Paper text:
We determined the crystal structures of p18mAUG1 and p18mAUG2 expressed in E. coli. The p18mAUG1 structure was solved by molecular replacement using the p18mAUG2 structure as a search model. Both constructs crystallised in the same P6522 hexagonal spacegroup with the p18mAUG1 crystals diffracting to a slightly higher resolution of 2.8 Å and the structure refined to an R-factor and Free R-factor of 25.6 and 26.4% respectively. In both structures, the asymmetric unit (ASU) comprises three copies of the p18m monomer. The structure has an all-helical fold making a five-helix bundle (α1-α5) comprising α1 (residues E265-A273), α2 (residues D284-N300), α3 residues (N306-M314), α4 (residues Y321-R330) and α5 (residues V336-Q351). In all copies, residues spanning D262 to Q351 are visible in the electron density map. There is no additional density for residues 249 to 259 that constitute the additional N-terminal sequence difference between [name] and AUG2. Quantitative mobility assays revealed that a fragment containing [name] to residue 355 of p18 retained potent restriction of [name], comparable to full-length p18. In the first (Dimer-1), the exposed surfaces of α1 and α3 pack against α1’ and α3’ of the opposing monomer. In the second interface (Dimer-2), residues on the outer surface of α4 and α5 pack against α4′ and α5′ of the opposing monomer.
Numbering used by the authors:
A (entry chain A): 261 to 350
B (entry chain B): 261 to 351
């Protein structure tokens, strides 16, 4: 709609995942936001994307934010493989 | 700073102004965020910028979000002139 970008930016900047939602849904939710913002000329590269996903990653997913440092050049895909790996083990 | 963009995006997406802070400070705060994001290759145009400023605009400033509709092509500068106008009169 007229208000889509500002709604994606606010969703992205206030993400909260602890493993209640399926990882499948949480992934395509975040991936779609990054495509929509990118096609609207708001470029959120893998670094800043991953920073925002890992913020408000909580519960048994918290620890991904501490390793994340040794993980520079980490893609969103790579970060979700981890979120998936953790989810399947619950 | 390695973490600047994600910090500006989170600040911008959670703005709250009711007229406690001087408009001067609230303006340069928001303007700086949009420059810093733009110099980091993240362009927030006037439309999306104004939408995010007007969200969490509250108190005697709320009403700017209801008019804002008839105000298409509205710049951030234009929106702050209003915030300033209201602030000088609260004082």
């Amino acid at each position: 709609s007229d208000t889509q970008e500002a709604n994606d930016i606010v969703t992205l900047a206030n993400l909260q995942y602890n493993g209640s939602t399926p990882a499948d849904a949480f992934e395509t939710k975040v991936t779609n936001i990054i495509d929509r913002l990118n096609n609207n000329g708001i470029h959120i590269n893998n670094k800043v994307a991953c920073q925002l996903i890992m913020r408000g990653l909580s519960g048994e997913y918290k620890f991904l934010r501490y390793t994340r440092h040794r993980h520079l050049n980490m893609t969103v895909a790579e970060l979700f493989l981890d979120i998936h790996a953790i989810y399947e083990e619950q």
